[PDB]
Design a protein around this motif. Structure first.
Motif, short mmCIF file in Angstrom:
data_model
loop_
_atom_site.label_atom_id
_atom_site.label_comp_id
_atom_site.label_asym_id
_atom_site.label_seq_id
_atom_site.Cartn_x
_atom_site.Cartn_y
_atom_site.Cartn_z
N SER A 67 0.83 -1.20 0.00
CA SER A 67 0.00 0.00 0.00
C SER A 67 0.87 1.25 0.00
N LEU A 68 0.33 2.34 -0.54
CA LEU A 68 1.04 3.61 -0.61
C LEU A 68 0.36 4.58 0.34
N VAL A 69 1.15 5.34 1.10
CA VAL A 69 0.57 6.31 2.01
C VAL A 69 1.09 7.70 1.67
N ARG A 70 0.18 8.65 1.53
CA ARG A 70 0.58 10.02 1.20
C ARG A 70 -0.05 10.96 2.22
N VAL A 71 0.74 11.91 2.70
CA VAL A 71 0.24 12.88 3.68
C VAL A 71 0.41 14.28 3.13
N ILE A 72 -0.65 15.07 3.22
CA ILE A 72 -0.60 16.45 2.77
C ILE A 72 -0.77 17.33 4.00
N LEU A 73 0.20 18.21 4.23
CA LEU A 73 0.16 19.10 5.39
C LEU A 73 -0.22 20.50 4.92
N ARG A 74 -1.14 21.14 5.65
CA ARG A 74 -1.57 22.48 5.28
C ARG A 74 -1.82 23.39 6.47
N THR A 75 -1.40 24.65 6.32
CA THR A 75 -1.64 25.69 7.30
C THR A 75 -2.14 26.85 6.43
N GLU A 76 -2.58 27.96 7.02
CA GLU A 76 -3.10 29.05 6.19
C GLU A 76 -2.15 29.53 5.08
N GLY A 83 0.94 27.68 4.46
CA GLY A 83 1.89 26.62 4.18
C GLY A 83 1.32 25.34 3.59
N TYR A 84 2.16 24.58 2.91
CA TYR A 84 1.71 23.34 2.28
C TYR A 84 2.87 22.42 1.94
N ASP A 85 2.67 21.12 2.13
CA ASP A 85 3.70 20.16 1.76
C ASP A 85 3.07 18.80 1.59
N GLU A 86 3.70 17.95 0.79
CA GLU A 86 3.19 16.62 0.53
C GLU A 86 4.30 15.60 0.77
N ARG A 119 5.08 27.53 14.09
CA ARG A 119 5.78 28.18 15.19
C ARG A 119 4.94 29.29 15.79
N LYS A 120 3.93 29.75 15.05
CA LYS A 120 3.04 30.79 15.54
C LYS A 120 1.81 30.15 16.19
N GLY A 121 1.84 28.82 16.30
CA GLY A 121 0.75 28.09 16.92
C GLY A 121 -0.53 27.99 16.10
N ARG A 122 -0.43 28.23 14.80
CA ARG A 122 -1.60 28.18 13.92
C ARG A 122 -2.10 26.77 13.64
N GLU A 123 -3.34 26.69 13.20
CA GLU A 123 -3.97 25.41 12.92
C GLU A 123 -3.28 24.64 11.81
N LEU A 124 -3.29 23.32 11.93
CA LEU A 124 -2.69 22.44 10.94
C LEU A 124 -3.73 21.42 10.49
N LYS A 125 -3.88 21.26 9.18
CA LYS A 125 -4.81 20.29 8.61
C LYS A 125 -3.94 19.18 8.06
N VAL A 126 -4.19 17.94 8.50
CA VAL A 126 -3.40 16.80 8.04
C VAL A 126 -4.26 15.79 7.29
N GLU A 127 -3.98 15.61 6.00
CA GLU A 127 -4.76 14.67 5.20
C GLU A 127 -3.93 13.44 4.87
N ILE A 128 -4.53 12.27 5.08
CA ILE A 128 -3.89 10.99 4.83
C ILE A 128 -4.59 10.33 3.66
#
Length: 144
Positions: free
Chosen positions: A63-72, A74-77, A127-136
């Motif tokens: 199986s393949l697992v991909r995570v997408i990280l997002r803040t207001e 910021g973004y990364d995969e 670092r500013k304590g902002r919300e983080l959305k984590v998609e799997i």
């Protein structure tokens, strides 16, 4: 092949540095020390153990697992792999690793990125304590 998605929430913390070179982690714990350089999210709405059972079954197999990280701002995969021996049962943490090392916190192995590689805009928001959305996102073979 099947595809399953799930989003969880967490927030940054003033002590997030994201300097770890082989892993990155999210935790339900609300506070982190000054030396937790692998943690990028706290107060998570999910531990690895609380993810949907259908997703846990899909991830733990050959199986393949991909995570997408997002803040207001910021973004990364991150792209990795599942493994038949992942137990996904830790009560507080979710960890993604670049090695093939496995523990109850491990959601993904042989990841292409660690905390160290994450988007600077993402780390700035955390670092500013902002919300983080984590998609799997898990893509898998139905029969195993």
């Amino acid at each position: 092949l099947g595809v399953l998605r799930y989003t969880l929430r967490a927030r940054g913390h003033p002590n997030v540095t994201a300097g770890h070179r082989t892993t990155f982690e999210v935790t339900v714990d609300p506070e982190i020390g000054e030396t937790a350089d692998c943690i990028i999210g706290v107060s998570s709405s999910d531990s690895i153990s609380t993810l949907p059972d259908e997703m846990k079954r899909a991830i733990a197999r050959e199986s393949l697992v991909r995570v997408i990280l997002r803040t207001e701002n910021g973004y990364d995969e991150i792209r990795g792999y599942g493994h038949p021996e992942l137990t996904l049962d830790h009560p507080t943490d979710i960890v993604c690793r670049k090695s093939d090392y496995i523990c109850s916190r491990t959601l993904m192995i042989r990841a292409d990125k660690a905390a160290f590689d994450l988007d600077e805009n993402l780390v700035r928001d955390l670092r500013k304590g902002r919300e983080l959305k984590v998609e799997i996102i898990v893509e898998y073979e139905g029969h195993h």
